[model samples]
Target: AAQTNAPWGLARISSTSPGTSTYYYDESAGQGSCVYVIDTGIEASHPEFEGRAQMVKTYYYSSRDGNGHGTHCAGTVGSRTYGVAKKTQLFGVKVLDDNGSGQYSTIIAGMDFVASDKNNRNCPKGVVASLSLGGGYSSSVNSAAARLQSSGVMVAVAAGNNNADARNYSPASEPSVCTVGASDRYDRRSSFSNYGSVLDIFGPGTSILSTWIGGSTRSISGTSMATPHVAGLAAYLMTLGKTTAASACRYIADTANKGDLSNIPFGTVNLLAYNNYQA
Candidate 1:
């Protein structure tokens, strides 16, 4: 069922993205930008997307959302009402299959596509890639993210949902990737989120509402939900002229709200900020 409900996670990130005041309009709501979701294919026909979603490539199964995970993450990255950057293009690069699993080689292939795509260069602002999937540590995945970052694509990755230290994970552990952990409605770290020095920031992840398969909407949880919040923000920031991947990450980390969280290293490193833009 398609329900008209508020996305609390978006509200938690920034008032501008889902704000009420006339002054809250964000001209850089990810305009001329794109974020690739490397997971199960997106349900391109989801109403939340308003026809902006595209299945640019697929490395595993058919380029259709067999599992709703990728669609949900994609919506959070760019859906009109549910996203942090409402105007950003959502591209599906399916790597995971119906079973919610994938190989490192396939995932790397998807990353390579996003990193070297001509369409990404065509975007006036730039492109970002959001990866909500992860497995045990793989130097190959780490190298892929680093290479993408070097090639000018902001890579946002999820710190696993194991509730353990993130330092042992693959993409999350990668030093150059913008690794994200989960936060709750109260702005506290989610109990299931992996935390440690490896995490770059925290985003609202629990009970996040977004587009789903079958032209539907649903609420889901995990670090997967959190990564797109950062990715969407990166795209929006790119519109503000933070075009370089490193600059976007720096601006986000420097401007986040750390006071809301206590001195927990993993929780306070980057607490996610919204409405920081003046225009």
Candidate 2:
């Protein structure tokens, strides 16, 4: 079976709950909670991802993995190896196709699947949506995204890898969305990551160590990987802030932010400080 346990040296199950919070955080070491992953379908059968991953939604509207981008993205957000919100529930929404391409129409279908909770029945509740895909501005879909926001769903999207102005991307460019940029292990933005005033926050994006295809693990880089950190943060903040997704998004943008300052890199951000911030 696809092994799911973290490397013995990486993390120790010092307590009851293995997920939630995360293996990376001493505070999250024994927590349990759920966060929804809105991306390509995850390997439901993988040992690490199997029972731990609940198929709350399965809309393969987009490509599955011609580029393995979605799979890698999913691994980053929910993988047992590197995920921050380990115990949080991961709901898969396959908007892109196997070719790694999906239009807003198809993407929205996937969103509707989750927004409606028709597929897995976990929509518009308290689940945070983590998206790794992006495109130039698309006002047509702004209303739809606004609808999701109105329903108390917190949406997090990658700031795109183009290194262009984040305002160019539609959903991510949208002010209502929590736009995340990639930072390296040292908090440096990846050379290729797009940045601007549009970015709402930042997370580890380069040289990020996490799960990969073939039931193995490795360090890959992208805004896609970074998006999940925000998703995990959103979940964690909700518990601590006692707030909704929108408020939690604003809370992170306001209080939990650190990389958007004078000196920082495109590395994955940590939860300890964020946890303490909630305190």
Candidate 3:
């Protein structure tokens, strides 16, 4: 059941305890699924990827990752060392610039591309977009997120690290998307994570060890790091027949570990995203 050794985020999700050294997930859970990392580009050549990561689309800049944010998120999604879904196809849908900042036009364009490519048989199991980047309230950005879901790609987004209401953010406020918040190794909310009515779930995000540029690793905190854990879980669920956005997201909510988090905010759910799939 244990695929390999794992970091705290990976290990914690598979068990009820806050302490663990192994990530127990079905080894076959994500064989044909795909997760589009919509952020600053990823370093596809990282050894942890083992040839599975690639830059499939670029909007603002070249596919190279001058910023390590996307690569780190992609690693949590499906890298061999810190992955949630180890076999899922990982694509770098570059929307943000090297500074990890981008306009709505660039972000929406990347979403459109993922929607357009949803039917490719290379990953017929399903498609999921990990939206770790967020902005102020924007109807236009929210529209594309819904459209991407309508096109059969599940979306897991960050609930911003503002430590304020998640409703103030664009994609996080979009009711159709899975707005994830940050939790820590001790099963408590991360101090800097956003909260409130729009937040859908929690994932371990504090000091998360993930693949970084230059073939290395880094520990970071934020909802950005927490999101890919849910995105990768969605992909794994897709391979197990939760094939649509609504279905996969609903399954995530249904199967999440309840009452494990500490000091959850007023309107946020107590649910922590879990991936210990069983029949």
Candidate 4:
């Protein structure tokens, strides 16, 4: 059952509704916020989007295609949904071309672009960045990630689709980055989710249903899809004044589902404090 293609839904929460809705309201309704998705460009024209969404710009690490993997990942994080940051503007950084693979230098350039308001002024007010692609064990780009974090920019990164340790990823492995591991709707660690010291928190990643290429929607499974869930949550936190990566990480860590930590780097954390706060 390794590559099963039956299609699956991403993380979904259950709540009672006042009328016909049991889903979280789309609080990010066109808050004029911009989120930089450092991967493939988004489909941007989907219909299920519950709020306004647009593409910021595209950069070159490649011009090829990767069967729409990057685009799918973006949909999972910021696309308009019944419960998404639907009004958020998205900017795509094409670090990896269509091949689903890219070079580190290209990724660096994309980060530089995100940090430069001259390239786009979206950074100051609405700059929540997400990177669903990553590799193992290297501080190669840690400095830039930290710089971005210090500037009130929150980053969310995939914990690699592989079930290896968090030590296996770049930017994600950096402590300042909000490393996102994968979990099912039940918050159960996906059998394939990586763990270890670098993991800041977990998010929906299994059986994910989201936007796809050519204005379609489908279900795909991977940690890549999971990172965006946390990214969206972090954006909500930004609305709540917890704007820094460190603070966001602390909030997520406090709000995560704690299970067996014999292998996890730190003890499990809880977000009860943040969870109890009202808007």
Candidate 5:
């Protein structure tokens, strides 16, 4: 059976299942929230998803998940055992190809598709977008994120796993989006995780175990692994009617775990992302 308690990341953020007294939001199960994972793709049939993951759209050569990265991220965002917002609706946007290769223009197009209301039902309401990929700085991609934010979609991106400044990357450096870096269960930044003023939060990314492709679960480490934790938290917050992306961003930053990154020179707001929701 899946564990009854929430995952460490969720616990760290003070989020709990419906049974917990600390669980403030009765609408906290993510039922009204939607999370869009902009990555390779998702194995929608994974047991962890319980059939909630929808392959509503794709922007790649194929929507099937040959690469397990997207599925892993999806699981972290909504899986019953590993997810933060366990009941949140999940969707996949395949920006990266089977070989995990993609261009900034393609990514921008995928983000555009996500924000577009061309199909109201499938695209209705706002979303929390989880992006685990990285590339050099691109003004177009940055603009796309800004536009999405303006449309009420909260974007959570990975600070590249290069162990350098996150300011050196694109989506992580983009304005108005939540740039996430990797931290271990011990609250130490992962050795490979990028850091800097641009990184807005840190999540449990080291040795994270989640649903993979072909009906399996695996443990992996990277800033990519960290981004979904924040995305899931964003979705959970949205369930509480924090509809505006800017409001969600503010709440997350303000309620996050402060003084958690002792090794970093940056202030608490730049280093930690915690959940302090109460009923």
Candidate 6:
């Protein structure tokens, strides 16, 4: 059996709906949506940003992305180049240190910062937060994520790379957060992706290419990489009139493609992330 597929995660999602090798999407493509990249930090000046990305909040001192993790996730979310929502406004909420490490406290603070920023907006056409980090269970972290959703940010979080029960994690286990699992180029669960429920959907996470620090790009794999694609899709739906976080999450799950993913565990939602484009 022979088939054609794209190595580009962007092109993969654009299609599910690609024999033609085109990445199709709406021209607006989250033009007015807002996404908060909550991670180590983002190199907003990367050419991928095209002036739409900015670091708005930081737990540590002002710094460019010393660690490349956040920039990659930010790029996957909505950079002018590798973004799922090409034109969405990107705000970097630096919750982790330059080493891509952070305590639950810093993560909680980051969520609070995003909630506060969104509140003052008076209105959001569409808003989302990409949380590509998490650890073991923390009641406080779960509460913080819930409060963030209450305050109007559609949160998309990684299900962790532990390959354990995702329900054992904090933000990923949080009901208010849209927990994302990892799928590879072949639309199968990545071997290291955490499973056992709490997964709202899956995204292309294996060897995903996205913007990195110092004006370059990199290929990395993790639930971290998967979260941003879901965040971008949620932002896209938000712009398409899925106003609330619940609505956007629901629509994403509903619109997602099923029955193609492989090696999925019992109780795990087997929906593979899709941008719903037809080419």
> How well is each residue in 5-55 modelled by candidate 5, as lDDT tens digits?
555555555532212322222345677678889999999989899989978
Score candidate 1 by TM-score against the native: 0.90
Top lDDT hit: 3
Model 6 misplacement above 4 A:
1-7, 17-21, 120-123
lDDT tens digits by residue: candidate 2, 1-279: 112354321221111221322333434421344455555556544555646655554445432333455556655555556655544566666676666667888777666556666334432325677788877688765555666666667788888898777777867777787778775544356676777777777666766666555666666778887787777666655644445776767777565534333243334332212433311
Please estimate how well model 2 matches the true structure, expressed as its whole-model Cα lDDT: 0.59
Q: For model 1, where is the 10-residue window of minimal lDDT? A: 16-25
- The CA lDDT at 189 in model 5 is 80
What TM-score would you give candidate 2 relative to the actual structure? 0.77
Best by TM-score: 3
lDDT of each: 0.80, 0.59, 0.88, 0.59, 0.77, 0.84
List, residue by residue over 119-221, the lDDT tens digit for candidate 3. Answer: 6538878788999999998989999998987888889999999999988898888988889999999998999999998888899889999999999999999
- Estimate the TM-score of every prediction: 0.90, 0.77, 0.96, 0.79, 0.88, 0.93
Q: 183 in model 1: Cα distance from truth in Å?
A: 0.3
Question: Candidate 6 lDDT, tens digit per residue, 1-279?
Answer: 111332367776766632233556776688778999999888999998999888888888775789999999999998766788888889898899998899999899999989989765422566799999999999999999988887878999999999888989989999778899998877779899998768888888999888999999889999999999999988877876754676677678888887678899888888887778654
Whole-model lDDT, model 6:
0.84
Candidate 3, superposed: residue stretches over 4 Å from native: none
For candidate 2, the per-residue lDDT at 20 reads: 26
Give each prediction's root-mean-square deviation over alpha carbons. Answer: 3.7, 6.3, 1.4, 6.0, 3.6, 3.3
* Candidate 3 global lDDT: 0.88
The Cα RMSD in angstroms, rounded to one decimal, for candidate 5 relative to the true structure is 3.6
